[PDB]
Ligand binder design. Structure first.
Ligand SMILES: Nc1nc2c(ncn2[C@@H]2O[C@H](COP(=O)(O)OP(=O)(O)NP(=O)(O)O)[C@@H](O)[C@H]2O)c(=O)[nH]1
Ligand SMILES: [Ca+2]
Ligand SMILES: [Ca+2]
Ligand SMILES: [Mg+2]
Ligand SMILES: [Mg+2]
Length: 166
């Protein structure tokens, strides 16, 4: 069947793991255990197509930045995650986009910009600001909460649909 290689990237603590685990395992991870690099695989039906999602859950802790080139090489689509209550994490997105862009040598890499933790009220990144960033990359912006499940399937499925447009 069709395999889609997704890679989840973004600053430490933005909820990359919580998002992936919510998608794959249907529960919310409340505790914070920084990730080195984990893999998840699951067969799902997306728009009538039975396919395999191979998802790489990457490290946001900057001390592991050396591992980025490797995973950006293999991945087919990238979920670029920031947290809506973390302005620095939003600012950090460009550095992830730029590296993906360099590694793929393409201004046309399947990506989705994700504003996570939308269940929290301490918002410092307004939807419109993120929409604008995404528009500049030519990609969708989707808000999510790994806690409530809001937008979680939408984000990952949209990334699959972006890979399909390429
Ligand atoms: N309220 C709320 N908390 C969230 C959400 N997503 C993640 N968190 C919380 O934020 C913390 C960090 O989540 P985690 O998924 O570990 O982040 P990460 O981006 O994978 N970190 P790392 O880059 O170090 O691997 C955890 O306490 C988790 O419960 C969300 O949507 N809402
Ligand atoms: Ca829990
Ligand atoms: Ca682009
Ligand atoms: Mg993690
Ligand atoms: Mg502001």
């Amino acid at each position: 069947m069709t395999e889609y290689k997704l890679v989840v990237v973004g600053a430490g603590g933005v909820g990359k793991s919580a998002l992936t685990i919510q998608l794959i395992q249907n529960h919310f991870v409340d505790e914070y255990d920084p990730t080195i690099e984990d893999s998840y695989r699951k067969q799902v039906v997306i728009d009538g197509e039975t396919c395999l999602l191979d998802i790489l859950d990457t490290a946001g802790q900057e001390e592991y930045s050396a591992m980025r080139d490797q995973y950006m090489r293999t991945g087919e689509g990238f979920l670029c995650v920031f947290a809506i209550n973390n302005t620095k994490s939003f600012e950090d997105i460009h550095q992830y986009r730029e590296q993906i862009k360099r590694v793929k040598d393409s201004d046309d890499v399947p990506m989705v910009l994700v504003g996570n933790k939308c269940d929290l009220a301490a918002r410092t990144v307004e939807s419109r600001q993120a929409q604008d960033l995404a528009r500049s990359y030519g990609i969708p912006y989707i808000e999510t909460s790994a806690k409530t499940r809001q937008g979680v399937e939408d984000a990952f499925y949209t990334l699959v649909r972006e890979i399909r447009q390429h």
